[PDB]
Write an enzyme that holds these catalytic residues in place. Structure first.
Site, mmCIF file in Angstrom:
data_model
loop_
_atom_site.group_PDB
_atom_site.id
_atom_site.type_symbol
_atom_site.label_atom_id
_atom_site.label_comp_id
_atom_site.label_asym_id
_atom_site.label_seq_id
_atom_site.Cartn_x
_atom_site.Cartn_y
_atom_site.Cartn_z
ATOM 1 N N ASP A 185 0.859 -1.196 0.000
ATOM 2 C CA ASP A 185 0.000 0.000 0.000
ATOM 3 C C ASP A 185 0.886 1.234 0.000
ATOM 4 O OD1 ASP A 185 0.630 -0.940 2.669
ATOM 5 O OD2 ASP A 185 -1.055 0.271 3.506
ATOM 6 N N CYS A 219 -7.623 -1.829 -5.850
ATOM 7 C CA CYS A 219 -6.675 -2.032 -4.743
ATOM 8 C C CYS A 219 -7.446 -1.763 -3.457
ATOM 9 C CB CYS A 219 -5.442 -1.174 -4.998
ATOM 10 S SG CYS A 219 -5.716 0.571 -5.401
ATOM 11 N N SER A 220 -6.897 -0.969 -2.562
ATOM 12 C CA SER A 220 -7.590 -0.449 -1.363
ATOM 13 C C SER A 220 -8.629 0.614 -1.793
ATOM 14 C CB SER A 220 -6.474 0.087 -0.467
ATOM 15 O OG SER A 220 -5.588 0.981 -1.201
ATOM 16 N N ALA A 221 -8.187 1.778 -2.224
ATOM 17 C CA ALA A 221 -9.031 2.926 -2.606
ATOM 18 C C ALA A 221 -9.324 2.915 -4.121
ATOM 19 C CB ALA A 221 -8.418 4.215 -2.130
ATOM 20 N N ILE A 223 -7.162 3.946 -6.507
ATOM 21 C CA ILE A 223 -6.577 5.162 -7.153
ATOM 22 C C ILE A 223 -5.039 5.098 -7.268
ATOM 23 C CG2 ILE A 223 -8.561 6.622 -6.602
ATOM 24 C CD1 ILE A 223 -7.010 7.871 -4.347
ATOM 25 N N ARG A 225 -2.316 2.214 -6.646
ATOM 26 C CA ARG A 225 -1.873 1.026 -7.394
ATOM 27 C C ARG A 225 -2.727 0.852 -8.659
ATOM 28 N NH1 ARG A 225 -1.626 -2.549 -1.983
ATOM 29 N NH2 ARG A 225 -3.337 -1.106 -1.423
ATOM 30 N N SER A 226 -4.038 1.050 -8.542
ATOM 31 C CA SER A 226 -4.987 0.967 -9.685
ATOM 32 C C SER A 226 -4.664 2.028 -10.756
ATOM 33 C CB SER A 226 -6.412 1.065 -9.177
ATOM 34 O OG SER A 226 -6.696 -0.081 -8.396
ATOM 35 N N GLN A 263 -0.806 7.921 -6.212
ATOM 36 C CA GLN A 263 -0.917 8.530 -4.852
ATOM 37 C C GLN A 263 0.423 9.053 -4.318
ATOM 38 O OE1 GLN A 263 -3.579 8.826 -2.368
ATOM 39 N NE2 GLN A 263 -4.262 9.553 -4.396
#
Length: 296
Positions: A185, A219-221, A223, A225-226, A263
């Site tokens: 992350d 991914c998590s959010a 934004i 990694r995506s 990010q």
């Protein structure tokens, strides 16, 4: 084919030389257009959002068709120039796994690309929305089940073949689930080779082509990694078509579809490195595969 560094190569050199990655990242943050996200901020959508400040724009959000509440934290990222469209979404919540599979069904998705682990530095970032044993997983709220057909476990990723069944209709689809297991992350892949081997395993399944629904990338959010995955893939496609690309402007254009794509400054730098290396592609992909050490 040219001795002279490409624009991208030269930009990278002097960005590194001048240590200008954070200022470039701040420029992109400053030039990013905000768009309305009223639907995400409806009070009835609170338990549908994993994170308060990661919301799809009203204009590009994915709608759950024929539902009382059509909201899912997912964005259609549509780059006409590249004949490329992705859904970027957050890691599903326990109560939105059912919405996730409905969206996969309605959108005619063939592939799900998961770039996160379920637990990252002791934070739960995603619900386990697919089975890993022989047990059929039931999503009673939207009427879907998921079964594991088979899995290919590599050193840093697993591909799960899933049977998605629309229980109301009896119809089934095979979904390729590509799980990158070592991309931390707010972090970067281990190398351009490991990332690109993964991307080209996704491409080679046909899951990003116009003859299927958009690939779902999360991914998590959805934004960081995506955004990295999507940026690199989009820039590569623009480049083979013969476009002379500005990565900053391509990122600002993708940011019109979903806020905050990429990010960290390091993620931006890694995107550059992966695009520079990726621009070189049958044997190139063979080297990526070996350097990735996927069979350890």
């Amino acid at each position: 084919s040219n001795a002279m560094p490409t624009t991208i190569e030269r930009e990278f050199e002097e960005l590194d030389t001048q240590r200008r990655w954070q200022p470039l990242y701040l420029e992109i943050r400053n030039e990013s257009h905000d768009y309305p996200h009223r639907v995400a901020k409806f009070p009835e959508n609170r338990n549908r959002n994993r994170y308060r400040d990661v919301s799809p724009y009203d204009h590009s959000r994915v709608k759950l068709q024929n539902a009382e509440n059509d909201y899912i934290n997912a964005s259609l990222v549509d780059i006409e120039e590249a004949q490329r469209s992705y859904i970027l979404t957050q890691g599903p919540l326990p109560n939105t796994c059912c919405h996730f599979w409905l969206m996969v069904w309605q959108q005619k998705t063939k592939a799900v690309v998961m770039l996160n682990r379920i637990v990252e530095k002791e934070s739960v970032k995603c619900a386990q929305y697919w089975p890993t044993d022989d047990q059929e997983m039931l999503f009673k709220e939207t009427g879907f089940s998921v079964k594991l057909l088979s899995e290919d476990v590599k050193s840093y990723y697993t591909v799960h073949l899933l049977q998605l069944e629309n229980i109301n209709s009896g119809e089934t689809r095979t979904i390729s689930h590509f799980h990158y297991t070592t991309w931390p992350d707010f972090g970067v892949p281990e190398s351009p080779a490991s990332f690109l081997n993964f991307l080209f395993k996704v491409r080679e399944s046909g899951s990003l082509n116009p003859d299927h629904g958009p690939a779902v990338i999360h991914c998590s959010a959805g934004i960081g990694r995506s955004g990295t995955f999507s940026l690199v893939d989009t820039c590569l496609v623009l480049m083979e078509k013969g476009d002379d690309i500005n990565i900053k402007q391509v990122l600002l254009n993708m940011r019109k579809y979903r806020m905050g794509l990429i990010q960290t400054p390091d993620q931006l730098r890694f995107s550059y490195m992966a695009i520079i290396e990726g621009a070189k592609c049958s044997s190139i992909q063979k080297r990526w595969k070996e350097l990735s050490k996927e069979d350890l």
